[PDB]
Amino acid sequence: GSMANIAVQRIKREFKEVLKSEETSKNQIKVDLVDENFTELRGEIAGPPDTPYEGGRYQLEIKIPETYPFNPPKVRFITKIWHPNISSVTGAICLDILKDQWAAAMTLRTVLLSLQALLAAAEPDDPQDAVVANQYKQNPEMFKQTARLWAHVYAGAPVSSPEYTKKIENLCAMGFDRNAVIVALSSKSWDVETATELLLS
Amino acid sequence: GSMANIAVQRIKREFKEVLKSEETSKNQIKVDLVDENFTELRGEIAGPPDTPYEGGRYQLEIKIPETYPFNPPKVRFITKIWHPNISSVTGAICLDILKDQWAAAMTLRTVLLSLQALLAAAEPDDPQDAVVANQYKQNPEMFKQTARLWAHVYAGAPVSSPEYTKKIENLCAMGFDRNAVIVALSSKSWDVETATELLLS
């Protein structure tokens, strides 16, 4: 149940390359094996500095395709994040190289570093999440407060808005699922009432 | 198909307590839901300060029993750790309250804090890992550096030990499993020759 030689050799040398990078030694990126045949790795990138993601660590799900290196790996955020180019529900990534701009010269390391660059420079005009993309543009300060809250509760970042977490708690007291309440409130400009109806939809 | 009333109410209440604790706001502990009916949770404790585990974040597999709160939860480390009371191989935990000293009054929060405390003060006279317990007593400086290496590699603590990493890299250079390489070295007082033999058993 193994992959073709060119695929295995590529993944094995790129796995090593990541493990020996200056970026990994500085805890910026990392990757582990999940499947013994290299068909599924587990990544983790650190939230970039001077970013709502600063302090956060984000786990990735890397699934290597049988066609590697001629096709890109399927990458998805395991750790919930609030970003224009990432689905706040599934973790699906909307990025260049993971779709139509992948090149055979790219590596596991390059994909990890690029996902880290994406966190530091979003593309709300080519979003993966319309709800997030829009908030990013219409009310930037609310997006930054929500991204930072998502970073703290899901990725270990320092800690955000007491106001937000008081509302989260109020809705959870009403018996709603915490994760549902967080994305509901984050999608309704943090209005408890409009968020409550969305939770009843 | 869920748990009995007494068990669900405790878990719900304890899951709430954790989220609203001063410790979770300070990034020391936290728990999420893995199952809908509360039978499985996922914790994460912070490496204690002035310890080989400082800077690392540790995930835990928490399985609540049908008899909760009259019996303790089944906690196991998901994140690999080098500690006297924790299997460096399976992550099993040897601790008072998880076995015969559990009390109906203990909570998810207290369990998480007890685990965090155990990292700060090991009990090599009631070990889970004999190899670790022994290295801990016989060569304390090697233990501190191996624990600190395991923390950078699996928990995300700052880097540590150029010598250790080189020996691991050289053995990986042979196509040995990396985690197999790391435990062999760690278990063989970092002797390349003996570890390389263990890696052939």
Curated annotation (Swiss-Prot), chains A, B:
<dbReference type="GO" id="GO:0006511">
    <property type="term" value="P:ubiquitin-dependent protein catabolic process"/>
</dbReference>
<dbReference type="Pfam" id="PF00179">
    <property type="entry name" value="UQ_con"/>
</dbReference>
<dbReference type="InterPro" id="IPR023313">
    <property type="entry name" value="UBQ-conjugating_AS"/>
</dbReference>
<comment type="pathway">
    <text>Protein modification; protein ubiquitination.</text>
</comment>
<feature type="domain" description="UBA">
    <location>
        <begin position="162"/>
        <end position="201"/>
    </location>
</feature>
<dbReference type="GO" id="GO:0034450">
    <property type="term" value="F:ubiquitin-ubiquitin ligase activity"/>
</dbReference>
<keyword id="KW-0067">ATP-binding</keyword>
<keyword id="KW-0832">Ubl conjugation</keyword>
<keyword id="KW-0963">Cytoplasm</keyword>
<keyword id="KW-0547">Nucleotide-binding</keyword>
<dbReference type="GO" id="GO:0000209">
    <property type="term" value="P:protein polyubiquitination"/>
</dbReference>
<dbReference type="GO" id="GO:0031625">
    <property type="term" value="F:ubiquitin protein ligase binding"/>
</dbReference>
<feature type="cross-link" description="Glycyl lysine isopeptide (Lys-Gly) (interchain with G-Cter in SUMO1); alternate">
    <location>
        <position position="16"/>
    </location>
</feature>
<dbReference type="InterPro" id="IPR016135">
    <property type="entry name" value="UBQ-conjugating_enzyme/RWD"/>
</dbReference>
<dbReference type="GO" id="GO:0005737">
    <property type="term" value="C:cytoplasm"/>
</dbReference>
<dbReference type="InterPro" id="IPR000608">
    <property type="entry name" value="UBQ-conjugat_E2_core"/>
</dbReference>
<dbReference type="GO" id="GO:0035458">
    <property type="term" value="P:cellular response to interferon-beta"/>
</dbReference>
<dbReference type="GO" id="GO:0060340">
    <property type="term" value="P:positive regulation of type I interferon-mediated signaling pathway"/>
</dbReference>
<keyword id="KW-0597">Phosphoprotein</keyword>
<keyword id="KW-0808">Transferase</keyword>
<dbReference type="GO" id="GO:0032434">
    <property type="term" value="P:regulation of proteasomal ubiquitin-dependent protein catabolic process"/>
</dbReference>
<dbReference type="GO" id="GO:0010800">
    <property type="term" value="P:positive regulation of peptidyl-threonine phosphorylation"/>
</dbReference>
<comment type="function">
    <text>Accepts ubiquitin from the E1 complex and catalyzes its covalent attachment to other proteins. In vitro, in the presence or in the absence of BRCA1-BARD1 E3 ubiquitin-protein ligase complex, catalyzes the synthesis of 'Lys-48'-linked polyubiquitin chains. Does not transfer ubiquitin directly to but elongates monoubiquitinated substrate protein. Mediates the selective degradation of short-lived and abnormal proteins, such as the endoplasmic reticulum-associated degradation (ERAD) of misfolded lumenal proteins. Ubiquitinates huntingtin.</text>
</comment>
<dbReference type="GO" id="GO:1903265">
    <property type="term" value="P:positive regulation of tumor necrosis factor-mediated signaling pathway"/>
</dbReference>
<comment type="subunit">
    <text>Interacts with RNF138/NARF. Interacts with BRCA1.</text>
</comment>
<dbReference type="GO" id="GO:0010994">
    <property type="term" value="P:free ubiquitin chain polymerization"/>
</dbReference>
<feature type="modified residue" description="N-acetylalanine">
    <location>
        <position position="4"/>
    </location>
</feature>
<dbReference type="GO" id="GO:0005634">
    <property type="term" value="C:nucleus"/>
</dbReference>
<feature type="modified residue" description="N6-acetyllysine; alternate">
    <location>
        <position position="16"/>
    </location>
</feature>
<dbReference type="GO" id="GO:0061631">
    <property type="term" value="F:ubiquitin conjugating enzyme activity"/>
</dbReference>
<dbReference type="GO" id="GO:0004842">
    <property type="term" value="F:ubiquitin-protein transferase activity"/>
</dbReference>
<keyword id="KW-1017">Isopeptide bond</keyword>
<comment type="similarity">
    <text>Belongs to the ubiquitin-conjugating enzyme family.</text>
</comment>
<dbReference type="InterPro" id="IPR015940">
    <property type="entry name" value="UBA"/>
</dbReference>
<feature type="modified residue" description="Phosphoserine">
    <location>
        <position position="161"/>
    </location>
</feature>
<dbReference type="InterPro" id="IPR009060">
    <property type="entry name" value="UBA-like_sf"/>
</dbReference>
<dbReference type="GO" id="GO:0005829">
    <property type="term" value="C:cytosol"/>
</dbReference>
<dbReference type="GO" id="GO:0032433">
    <property type="term" value="C:filopodium tip"/>
</dbReference>
<dbReference type="Pfam" id="PF00627">
    <property type="entry name" value="UBA"/>
</dbReference>
<keyword id="KW-0007">Acetylation</keyword>
<keyword id="KW-0833">Ubl conjugation pathway</keyword>
<feature type="domain" description="UBC core">
    <location>
        <begin position="6"/>
        <end position="156"/>
    </location>
</feature>
